[PDB]
Design a protein around this ligand. Structure first.
Ligand SMILES: Nc1nc2c(ncn2[C@@H]2O[C@H](COP(=O)(O)CP(=O)(O)OP(=O)(O)O)[C@@H](O)[C@H]2O)c(=O)[nH]1
Ligand SMILES: Nc1nc2c(ncn2[C@@H]2O[C@H](COP(=O)(O)OP(=O)(O)OP(=O)(O)O)[C@@H](O)[C@H]2O)c(=O)[nH]1
Ligand SMILES: [Mg+2]
Ligand SMILES: [Mg+2]
Lengths: 426, 428, 323
């Protein structure tokens, strides 16, 4: 019931996804081999949300791996749980997208998408009650951007009644990679705004900064960055598989999060966070989660919520708590911080409570914020873009693949309008 | 003899239900397996030797709510036919609950209800549980209520339902669901008992001394109201008052049908060591604004009517004296319309306490049902919240996409306004 | 000339089914700028009031309506101003014919325009008049230019559609026959109401290139960009009671909702952002506060039989002034 198909794409996507599946597999009692050897019947009652049940009590991730760089598939296969993923769902090409959206959208990507989409159809047709598609990728490149965009567009057209839930990594204003970062991001955002129903803007700069300052890691790696991302992803899809005092599915989440359908971009976060040393000082109660959760320093965005105000926020609390404590703290937050919320919404906080905490915690919380400060992300991307487009920098690499100049004009326009709309509510 | 069929709609509907059934079971001594190592048939039909089953239907568009029921200890009590689910929830969306998903569930549900009704003869009415802020608890229940008003019509349509609290809220489209729910409620229900959330927590922390109440604390208090309302159904009294007599003595005017309620004493087991729980003390407690389960304040209006149900070790002369004392308390005003406004009943059976509960076991208790102009405040708060959302059409697209017309929000708003107006005018 | 929004309601005579039914009682009274609808709901008698510029009752015909406002619109457009007019209305109104006739909106407009253009070119003596046309319809959120006999991407250099056909018109008759062909291409939804109900928003564009080739002004080119937009009326799910119903509940009802937000925002001078909410809005963004005359028309019958529908209609429409 309310099955989820997870489509990973690009190396970022496939690595985040690898960790995502590691985490949820532990949560459902699934060994690195795929067999179930868990703690509670609950783990099986909803195991089918993410896994296909198979002979031998093997639970196979209902997921697809995607890139134009074959080593990627073997890299996923080389890890624990890599042998659980269905051998058939590693779909790949032999080229790389060249860090070029057009190559991954109009050319090599087109061939890959038709192959991938057919795999998607089979996994989807095999479901009794599909809730949606979870997609994981980055804006920073070719496959995650181009393939991501083309594939998600086709999937939504074939499955318009299902949720298109995208978790994606957005480029840093400072910690850049390619010389065309803004082209790839802008060209994808252009369609992102029409194809995705729900978007989580995972900011790589912030992600690093959280690990560096909050968790106080001396030498954080992408694995550590992925730990926090996995906490978000696994944190969002909680009550679907972990019932409690106040339940909520993704449709419910969406209904109570986006008042103006275009504004479906969120800033993720997770609490509690701690260094190992700081564990000795934690006040492990609802007020601890509350005060950490609404602390701007722990928001996984380069945007700083104190900049503006929130349109809508939500939290899913998990574990050992009373409902009164949750309600009390949320009211106290809105009163305490009333200057940070939009006055048009008579209650800016959506809640849910799961009776099962993440493993190792007495309690926890998933935090989603539809903040007006998100305009900072997109504004900064636009500035990076217009600087290059105005000089036709690297334009030869994209128009050389058949793109029109008009495509850049349209993409820029959508981003600028997107930014203006967020600003409209400040 | 006489009987009721319960309907539980939405997660809260179902969990309130589960709590209510635990209490009903305890009051009669039925075990979770249906054995009982009479008036028991008011709810639990004998089905065969050694087996009794409660008459109820549980519904939620989400499989989980019912699975929680199916896997509980009472899995051996309820017949499997009584448990109905959808595949996807209403997502806190009235339109989805009424026009989109509830569209198929309703046939499954009416079948079961019809089958329960056909198996009995004393049916006096239905007891439905839902929340004005929900999806299934709004849209689906609205659908069901309309249908039942056709299938039965004449049987009592009684309901218990949660209204949005002054401050405590769980969702953000909650104001829309509540206005829409009212529109239907007003033309199909016979008697709707208003239930708060925040007020009840406040009762829990002050009267029951609970620092951190949960949904099971709220449900035990709700359960006490439910038990007392049906106490006359189930047990002999000195002054027997029928469920239809309550309704007869409830409504001063055809458009007035939302009683408010409380319960006393509500004391912790520790306070019970010292509290002087006399008939008069309990009676007096029931009129203090601080103890109402509805956040309203009677000192700012008039009572249209008031009915007290005494349970347990009470003597009619002391009861009459206590009420007579209340009649002199000028701080309590009644509409000019009803100089004979007080009603009273006395049941021989005291209320019971659910194991694990905070509520003290007492020899005397009072369940107070009342009809007052103070209810307008609840409505006013809702209208203000609704208008902000409505004015900018926030989240309206979520309802329109399920087939709801924009005009339905407008009309429901006008009906809500009319509702408040009527309760204001009858204040004389 | 510019976006002042004038609003008209056209009350219709009852049709034969409406007259035959026991609910043929008319409950609508129209005064020149206001509509009073007697509320008999729950027998609570109220003068429910709505306000209009043109509160036109059942006695008002097509020629009268033309003179009341269309006439005025056409004449301002032809001076070099844009205009966007849109229509809304009830099931059973036959607005799908009223919009054209042979005389309805498009043809009465077309006859007026060509009569005017013929007289004006005589005065100039051409006037380099040249009309471009298109039937850009929306079906399941897809564009459909019924002018052509696919990939209709919207772009804005400059707002236009990839492969949009722009036929160049010299005469009423060309339009007449083009329309006759174009209407055969209308795609439908099977509804309980009508098994062949149209299922689209439809933008008929009449764009006149005007060049003031007087002794002075020959260099001045103005464009009489007239949009006659037939909005799909909101669907009552019961009248469609299915896959298309859902597609069109969204495409129609959400689009109407959207246009609502747009208009309200326009009225509230809290504009621009809404221009991007839907392709319909974007396509009609030229109407949103620019040098475009605007006009809103809706058609209703008065019978008790159709009042819930009437009220929904009047709600949507009344908010054109009342938000
Ligand atoms: N948070 C994380 N970000 C990552 C990770 N790996 C890469 N990235 C970020 O994503 C961007 C690089 O993207 P990719 O390797 O995914 C490009 P992709 O393989 O999808 O397409 P190609 O253009 O064909 O390589 C950049 O911002 C990296 O800094 C990761 O494990 N975690
Ligand atoms: N009193 C009490 N409080 C609870 C319970 N569970 C949640 N609440 C309250 O009851 C409502 C909880 O809403 P839900 O049950 O999720 O609403 P719903 O009708 O199930 O809506 P959908 O499942 O979205 O259709 C809110 O009004 C809470 O304040 C319960 O068992 N009773
Ligand atoms: Mg790669
Ligand atoms: Mg539910």
């Amino acid at each position: 019931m309310r099955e989820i198909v997870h489509i990973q794409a690009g190396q970022c996507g496939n690595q985040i996804g690898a960790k995502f599946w590691e985490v949820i597999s532990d949560e459902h009692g699934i060994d690195p081999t795929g067999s179930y050897h868990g703690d509670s019947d609950l783990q099986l009652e909803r195991i089918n949300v993410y896994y296909n049940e198979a002979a031998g009590n093997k639970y196979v991730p209902r997921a697809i791996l995607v890139d134009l760089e074959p080593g990627t598939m073997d890299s996923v296969r080389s890890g624990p749980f890599g042998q659980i993923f269905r051998p058939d769902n590693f779909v790949f090409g032999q080229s790389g997208a060249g860090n070029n959206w057009a190559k991954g959208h109009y050319t090599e990507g087109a061939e890959l998408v038709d192959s991938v989409l057919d795999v998607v159809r089979k996994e989807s047709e095999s479901c009794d009650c599909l809730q949606g598609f979870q997609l994981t990728h980055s804006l920073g490149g070719g496959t995650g951007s181009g393939m991501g965009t083309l594939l998600i567009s086709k999937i939504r057209e074939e499955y318009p009644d299902r949720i298109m839930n995208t978790f994606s990594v957005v480029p840093s204003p400072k910690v850049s990679d390619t010389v065309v970062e803004p082209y790839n991001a802008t060209l994808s955002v252009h369609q992102l705004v029409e194809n995705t129903d729900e978007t989580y803007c995972i900011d790589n700069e912030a992600l690093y900064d959280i690990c560096f300052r909050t968790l106080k890691l001396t030498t954080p790696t992408y694995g550590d960055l992925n730990h926090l991302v996995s906490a978000t992803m696994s944190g969002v899809t909680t009550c679907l598989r972990f019932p409690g005092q106040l339940n909520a599915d993704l449709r419910k989440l969406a209904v109570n999060m986006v008042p103006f359908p275009r504004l479906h971009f969120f800033m993720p976060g997770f609490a509690p966070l701690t260094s190992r040393g700081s564990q000795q000082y934690r006040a492990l109660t609802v007020p601890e989660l509350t005060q950490q959760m609404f602390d701007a320093k722990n928001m996984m965005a380069a945007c700083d919520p104190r900049h503006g105000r929130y349109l809508t926020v939500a939290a899913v609390f998990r574990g050992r708590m009373s409902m009164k404590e949750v309600d009390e703290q949320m009211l106290n937050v809105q009163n305490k911080n009333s200057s940070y919320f939009v006055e048009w919404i008579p209650n800016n906080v959506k809640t849910a409570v799961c009776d099962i905490p993440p493993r190792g915690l007495k309690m926890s919380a998933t935090f989603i914020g539809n903040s007006t400060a998100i305009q900072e992300l997109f504004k900064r991307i636009s500035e990076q873009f217009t600087a290059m487009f105005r000089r036709k920098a690297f334009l030869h690499w994209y128009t050389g693949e058949g793109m029109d100049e008009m495509e850049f004009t349209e993409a820029e326009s959508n981003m600028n309008d997107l930014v203006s709309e967020y600003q409209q509510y400040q | 003899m006489r009987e009721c069929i319960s309907i539980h709609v939405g997660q809260a509907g179902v969990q309130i239900g589960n709590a209510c059934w635990e209490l009903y079971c305890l009051e009669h001594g039925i075990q979770p397996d249906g054995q009982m190592p009479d008036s028991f048939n008011t709810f639990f039909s004998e089905t065969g030797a050694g087996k009794h089953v409660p008459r109820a239907v549980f519904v939620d568009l989400e499989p989980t709510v019912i699975d929680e029921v199916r896997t509980g200890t009472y899995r051996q009590l309820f017949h499997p036919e009584q448990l109905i689910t959808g595949k996807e929830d209403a997502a806190n969306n009235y339109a989805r609950g009424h026009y989109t998903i509830g569209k198929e569930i309703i046939d499954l549900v009416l079948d079961r209800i019809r089958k329960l009704a056909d198996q009995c003869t004393g049916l006096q009415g239905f007891l439905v549980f839902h929340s004005f802020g929900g999806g299934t608890g709004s849209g689906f229940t609205s659908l069901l209520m309309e249908r039942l008003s056709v299938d039965y019509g004449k049987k009592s349509k009684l309901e218990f339902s949660i209204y949005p609290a002054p401050q405590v809220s769980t969702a953000v489209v909650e104001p829309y669901n509540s206005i829409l729910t009212t529109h239907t409620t007003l033309e199909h229900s016979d008697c709707a008992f208003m239930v708060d959330n925040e007020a009840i927590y406040d009762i829990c922390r002050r009267n029951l001394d609970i620092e951190r109440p949960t949904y099971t604390n709220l449900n035990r208090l709700i359960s006490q109201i439910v038990s007392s309302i049906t106490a006359s159904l189930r047990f002999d009294g000195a002054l027997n008052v029928d469920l239809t007599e309550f309704q007869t003595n409830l409504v001063p005017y055809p458009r007035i049908h939302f009683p408010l309620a409380t319960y006393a004493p509500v004391i912790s087991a520790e306070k019970a060591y010292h509290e002087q729980l006399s008939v008069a003390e309990i009676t007096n407690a029931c009129f203090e604004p601080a103890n109402q389960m509805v956040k309203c304040d009677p000192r700012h209006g008039k009572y249209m009517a008031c009915c007290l149900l005494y349970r347990g070790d009470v003597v009619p002369k002391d009861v009459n004296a206590a009420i007579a004392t209340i009649k002199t308390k000028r701080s309590i005003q009644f509409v000019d319309w009803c100089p004979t406004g007080f009603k009273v009943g006395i049941n021989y059976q005291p209320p019971t306490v659910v194991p694990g509960g905070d509520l003290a076991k007492v020899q005397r208790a009072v369940c107070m049902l009342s009809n007052t102009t103070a209810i307008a405040e609840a409505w006013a708060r809702l209208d203000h919240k609704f208008d902000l959302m409505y004015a900018k059409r926030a989240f309206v697209h979520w309802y329109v996409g399920e087939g709801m017309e924009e005009g339905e929000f407008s009309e429901a708003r006008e009906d809500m306004a009319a509702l408040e107006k009527d309760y204001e005018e009858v204040g004389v | 000339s510019c976006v002042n929004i004038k609003v008209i309601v056209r009350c219709r005579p009852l049709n034969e089914k409406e007259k035959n039914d026991i609910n043929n009682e008319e409950v609508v009274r129209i005064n020149n700028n206001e509509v009073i609808l007697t509320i008999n709901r729950n027998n609570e008698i109220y003068e429910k009031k709505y306000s209009f510029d043109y509160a036109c009752d059942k006695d008002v015909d097509q020629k009268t309506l033309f003179n009341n406002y269309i006439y005025q619109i056409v004449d301002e457009v032809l001076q070099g101003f844009n205009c966007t007019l849109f229509c809304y209305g009830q099931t059973g109104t036959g607005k799908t014919y009223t919009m054209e006739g042979k005389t309805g909106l498009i043809f009465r407009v077309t006859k007026r325009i060509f009569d005017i253009l013929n007289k004006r070119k005589e005065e100039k003596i051409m006037y380099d008049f040249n009309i471009k046309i298109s039937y850009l319809e929306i079906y399941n959120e897809e564009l459909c230019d019924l002018l052509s006999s696919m990939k209709l991407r919207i772009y804005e250099d400059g707002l236009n559609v990839d492969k949009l056909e722009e036929k160049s018109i010299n005469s009423f008759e060309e339009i007449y026959y083009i329309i006759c062909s174009a209407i055969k291409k209308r795609r439908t939804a099977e509804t309980a109401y009508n098994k062949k109900s149209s299922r689209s928003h439809s933008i008929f564009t009449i764009t006149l290139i005007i060049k003031d080739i007087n002794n002075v002004g020959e260099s001045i080119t103005k464009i009489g960009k007239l949009n006659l937009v037939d909005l799909a009326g909101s669907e009552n799910a019961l009248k469609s009671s299915l896959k298309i119903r859902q597609q069109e509940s969204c495409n129609i009802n959400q689009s109407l909702l959207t246009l609502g937000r747009v208009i309200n925002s326009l009225i509230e001078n809290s504009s621009y952002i809404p221009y991007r909410d839907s392709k319909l809005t974007r396509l009609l963004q030229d109407s949103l506060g620019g040098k475009t005359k605007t006009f809103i028309v809706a058609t209703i019958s008065p019978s008790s039989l159709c009042i819930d529908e009437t009220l929904s209609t009047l709600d949507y429409v009344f908010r054109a002034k009342n938000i």
